[PDB]
Design an enzyme around this catalytic site. Structure first.
Site, PDB file in Angstrom:
ATOM      1  N   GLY A   1      -4.235   2.580  -7.886  1.00 16.59           N
ATOM      2  CA  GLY A   1      -5.141   1.737  -7.138  1.00 16.59           C
ATOM      3  C   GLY A   1      -4.702   1.570  -5.699  1.00 16.59           C
ATOM      4  O   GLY A   1      -3.586   1.928  -5.315  1.00 16.59           O
TER       5      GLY A   1
ATOM      6  N   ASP B   1       3.325 -14.606 -16.186  1.00 18.73           N
ATOM      7  CA  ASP B   1       4.202 -14.003 -15.176  1.00 18.73           C
ATOM      8  C   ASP B   1       4.248 -14.867 -13.917  1.00 18.73           C
ATOM      9  O   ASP B   1       4.162 -14.379 -12.791  1.00 18.73           O
ATOM     10  CB  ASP B   1       3.775 -12.575 -14.838  1.00 18.73           C
ATOM     11  CG  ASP B   1       4.870 -11.796 -14.125  1.00 18.73           C
ATOM     12  OD1 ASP B   1       6.037 -12.246 -14.157  1.00 18.73           O
ATOM     13  OD2 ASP B   1       4.561 -10.743 -13.523  1.00 18.73           O
TER      14      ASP B   1
ATOM     15  N   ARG C   1       6.809 -14.173  -6.392  1.00 26.57           N
ATOM     16  CA  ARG C   1       6.212 -12.902  -5.993  1.00 26.57           C
ATOM     17  C   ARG C   1       4.733 -12.811  -6.352  1.00 26.57           C
ATOM     18  O   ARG C   1       4.021 -11.975  -5.783  1.00 26.57           O
ATOM     19  CB  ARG C   1       6.964 -11.743  -6.652  1.00 26.57           C
ATOM     20  CG  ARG C   1       6.932 -11.802  -8.168  1.00 26.57           C
ATOM     21  CD  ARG C   1       7.523 -10.555  -8.828  1.00 26.57           C
ATOM     22  NE  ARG C   1       7.503 -10.700 -10.281  1.00 26.57           N
ATOM     23  CZ  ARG C   1       8.377 -11.428 -10.957  1.00 26.57           C
ATOM     24  NH1 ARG C   1       9.394 -12.012 -10.351  1.00 26.57           N
ATOM     25  NH2 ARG C   1       8.217 -11.587 -12.267  1.00 26.57           N
ATOM     26  N   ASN C   2       4.255 -13.639  -7.278  1.00 24.60           N
ATOM     27  CA  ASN C   2       2.867 -13.599  -7.715  1.00 24.60           C
ATOM     28  C   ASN C   2       2.013 -14.695  -7.099  1.00 24.60           C
ATOM     29  O   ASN C   2       0.835 -14.806  -7.445  1.00 24.60           O
ATOM     30  CB  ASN C   2       2.788 -13.682  -9.243  1.00 24.60           C
ATOM     31  CG  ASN C   2       2.890 -12.320  -9.899  1.00 24.60           C
ATOM     32  OD1 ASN C   2       2.461 -11.320  -9.326  1.00 24.60           O
ATOM     33  ND2 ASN C   2       3.470 -12.268 -11.094  1.00 24.60           N
TER      34      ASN C   2
ATOM     35  N   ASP D   1      -1.688 -13.046  -9.674  1.00 27.88           N
ATOM     36  CA  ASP D   1      -0.919 -12.108 -10.485  1.00 27.88           C
ATOM     37  C   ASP D   1      -1.167 -10.722  -9.910  1.00 27.88           C
ATOM     38  O   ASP D   1      -2.298 -10.229  -9.956  1.00 27.88           O
ATOM     39  CB  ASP D   1      -1.325 -12.177 -11.960  1.00 27.88           C
ATOM     40  CG  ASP D   1      -0.355 -11.438 -12.877  1.00 27.88           C
ATOM     41  OD1 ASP D   1       0.284 -10.461 -12.433  1.00 27.88           O
ATOM     42  OD2 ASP D   1      -0.237 -11.827 -14.059  1.00 27.88           O
TER      43      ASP D   1
HETATM   44  C1  LIG Z   1       2.337  -1.935  -4.224  1.00 21.92           C
HETATM   45  N1  LIG Z   1       1.535  -3.068  -3.794  1.00 21.92           N
HETATM   46  C2  LIG Z   1       2.008  -4.133  -3.201  1.00 21.92           C
HETATM   47  C3  LIG Z   1       0.949  -4.970  -2.954  1.00 21.92           C
HETATM   48  C4  LIG Z   1      -0.200  -4.348  -3.437  1.00 21.92           C
HETATM   49  C5  LIG Z   1      -1.585  -4.896  -3.381  1.00 21.92           C
HETATM   50  C6  LIG Z   1      -1.808  -5.772  -2.172  1.00 21.92           C
HETATM   51  C7  LIG Z   1      -1.614  -6.979  -3.025  1.00 21.92           C
HETATM   52  N2  LIG Z   1      -2.624  -7.973  -2.877  1.00 21.92           N
HETATM   53  C8  LIG Z   1      -3.160  -8.564  -4.087  1.00 21.92           C
HETATM   54  C9  LIG Z   1      -2.510  -9.637  -4.665  1.00 21.92           C
HETATM   55  C10 LIG Z   1      -3.037 -10.177  -5.823  1.00 21.92           C
HETATM   56  F1  LIG Z   1      -2.460 -11.234  -6.459  1.00 21.92           F
HETATM   57  C11 LIG Z   1      -4.189  -9.666  -6.370  1.00 21.92           C
HETATM   58  N3  LIG Z   1      -4.598 -10.305  -7.587  1.00 21.92           N
HETATM   59  C12 LIG Z   1      -5.469  -9.699  -8.559  1.00 21.92           C
HETATM   60  O1  LIG Z   1      -5.991  -8.638  -8.438  1.00 21.92           O
HETATM   61  C13 LIG Z   1      -5.685 -10.531  -9.805  1.00 21.92           C
HETATM   62  C14 LIG Z   1      -6.403  -9.914 -10.915  1.00 21.92           C
HETATM   63  C15 LIG Z   1      -6.624 -10.662 -12.178  1.00 21.92           C
HETATM   64  N4  LIG Z   1      -6.093 -12.028 -12.290  1.00 21.92           N
HETATM   65  N5  LIG Z   1      -5.363 -12.618 -11.173  1.00 21.92           N
HETATM   66  C16 LIG Z   1      -4.898 -13.949 -11.372  1.00 21.92           C
HETATM   67  C17 LIG Z   1      -5.328 -14.962 -10.528  1.00 21.92           C
HETATM   68  C18 LIG Z   1      -4.871 -16.243 -10.779  1.00 21.92           C
HETATM   69  C19 LIG Z   1      -4.030 -16.418 -11.865  1.00 21.92           C
HETATM   70  F2  LIG Z   1      -3.558 -17.651 -12.146  1.00 21.92           F
HETATM   71  C20 LIG Z   1      -3.662 -15.357 -12.674  1.00 21.92           C
HETATM   72  N6  LIG Z   1      -4.117 -14.156 -12.408  1.00 21.92           N
HETATM   73  C21 LIG Z   1      -5.117 -11.909  -9.912  1.00 21.92           C
HETATM   74  O2  LIG Z   1      -4.509 -12.443  -9.031  1.00 21.92           O
HETATM   75  C22 LIG Z   1      -4.837  -8.588  -5.808  1.00 21.92           C
HETATM   76  C23 LIG Z   1      -4.315  -8.052  -4.647  1.00 21.92           C
HETATM   77  F3  LIG Z   1      -4.935  -7.005  -4.054  1.00 21.92           F
HETATM   78  C24 LIG Z   1      -2.705  -8.712  -1.630  1.00 21.92           C
HETATM   79  N7  LIG Z   1      -1.744  -8.520  -0.748  1.00 21.92           N
HETATM   80  C25 LIG Z   1      -1.762  -9.154   0.418  1.00 21.92           C
HETATM   81  C26 LIG Z   1      -2.798 -10.021   0.716  1.00 21.92           C
HETATM   82  N8  LIG Z   1      -3.789 -10.231  -0.190  1.00 21.92           N
HETATM   83  N9  LIG Z   1      -4.922 -11.060  -0.092  1.00 21.92           N
HETATM   84  C27 LIG Z   1      -5.614 -10.927  -1.232  1.00 21.92           C
HETATM   85  C28 LIG Z   1      -4.928 -10.030  -2.044  1.00 21.92           C
HETATM   86  C29 LIG Z   1      -3.776  -9.612  -1.337  1.00 21.92           C
HETATM   87  C30 LIG Z   1      -1.790  -6.095  -4.240  1.00 21.92           C
HETATM   88  N10 LIG Z   1       0.172  -3.171  -3.953  1.00 21.92           N
END
Ligand SMILES: Cn1ccc([C@H]2C[C@H](N(c3cc(F)c(NC(=O)c4ccnn(-c5ccc(F)cn5)c4=O)cc3F)c3nccn4nccc34)C2)n1
Length: 285
Positions: free
Chosen positions: A44, A158, A162-163, A176
């Site tokens: 992704g 988790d 970091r999350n 997450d």
């Molecule tokens: C190798 N590498 C390192 C980094 C990445 C990518 C970039 C990083 N990235 C990101 C973080 C997330 F966290 C998410 N999250 C989810 O897709 C998600 C799916 C399903 N459920 N939850 C959830 C939510 C609440 C809860 F209690 C429990 N779960 C999620 O958070 C998506 C992202 F693209 C962001 N980086 C900077 C700024 N921003 N600004 C918005 C998102 C981001 C990921 N790749």
């Protein structure tokens, strides 16, 4: 051509496709900055995006895409992940802005942009060097998000610095990115997770905050964490961490899950500690 993949939405689980249909984003309202990568992996990629609101004004977003798509199962898992957030509506929990379904190519999962990235890297940055009170405030914000999630019977599994992410207003969003040092004793032994094991992980997260992102148990490869915890040992009090906040950490690591505080209790206790520590702080918690 890889950019001509066409997804049959009628192959998806009926509850999934109903949920996706309620959050659809029209392609004309979204600009994906495909040349502005936030993070990339094998499967992704996440890009900067611009959403156009109903006044034509700009909303900064992050846009998740699959890279190469070869089967519907990959697509179902990707969309299911996005839809996890659909009914989350709390200032301290990351939300879903929607899902954009172009005729060809990957579906796009659209999230609010988090200016300051993940909380661990933010607090470790030497030119951020957050104050004690702001670190306590971040912990309070996480506690409030977890209190909301626990009320929805959502078990995170988790929780870690970091999350969590931090937006432009320095609001922490529990998230997450998709972990033995954060796991409760019973989860290490049985692989069962509950809200009470989320409380354990929150204790570790608080410790991360008050050390400005030090790795917990840095020598983990040289000992067994289950043995360590069974013999009553716990992470040691950070320097400059107020004594009552360390006692909160210790309560989160009680060996009996039911003896750990609820997230409601943690919000009340940490809010009391925040309110009586009179130091420099910058953010609205
Ligand atoms: C190798 N590498 C390192 C980094 C990445 C990518 C970039 C990083 N990235 C990101 C973080 C997330 F966290 C998410 N999250 C989810 O897709 C998600 C799916 C399903 N459920 N939850 C959830 C939510 C609440 C809860 F209690 C429990 N779960 C999620 O958070 C998506 C992202 F693209 C962001 N980086 C900077 C700024 N921003 N600004 C918005 C998102 C981001 C990921 N790749």
């Amino acid at each position: 051509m890889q950019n001509t993949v066409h997804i049959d939405l009628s192959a998806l689980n009926p509850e999934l496709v109903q949920a996706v249909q309620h959050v659809v984003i029209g392609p004309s309202s979204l600009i994906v900055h495909f040349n502005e990568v936030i993070g990339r992996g094998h499967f992704g990629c996440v890009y900067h995006g611009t959403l156009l609101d109903n006044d034509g004004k700009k909303i900064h977003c992050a846009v998740k895409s699959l890279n190469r798509i070869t089967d519907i199962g990959e697509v179902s898992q990707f969309l299911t992940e996005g839809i996890i957030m659909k009914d989350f509506s709390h200032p301290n929990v990351l939300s879903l802005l929607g899902i954009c379904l172009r005729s060809e190519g990957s579906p796009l999962v659209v999230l609010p942009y988090m200016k300051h990235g993940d909380l661990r890297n933010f607090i470790r940055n030497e030119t951020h060097n957050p104050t004690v009170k702001d670190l306590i405030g971040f912990g309070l914000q996480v506690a409030k998000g977890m209190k909301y999630l626990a009320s929805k019977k959502f078990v995170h599994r988790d929780l870690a610095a970091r999350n969590c992410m931090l937006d432009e207003k320095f609001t922490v969003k529990v998230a997450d990115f998709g972990p033995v040092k954060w796991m409760a004793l019973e989860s290490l032994q049985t692989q069962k997770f509950t809200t009470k094991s989320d409380v354990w992980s929150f204790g570790v997260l608080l410790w991360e905050l008050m050390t400005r992102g030090a790795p917990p148990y840095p020598d983990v490869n040289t000992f067994d964490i289950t043995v360590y915890l069974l013999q009553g040992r716990r992470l040691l009090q950070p320097e400059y961490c107020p004594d009552p906040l360390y006692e909160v950490m210790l309560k989160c690591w009680h060996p009996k899950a039911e003896m750990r505080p609820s997230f409601s209790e943690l919000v009340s206790r940490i809010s009391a500690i925040f309110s009586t520590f009179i130091g420099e702080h910058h953010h609205h918690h």
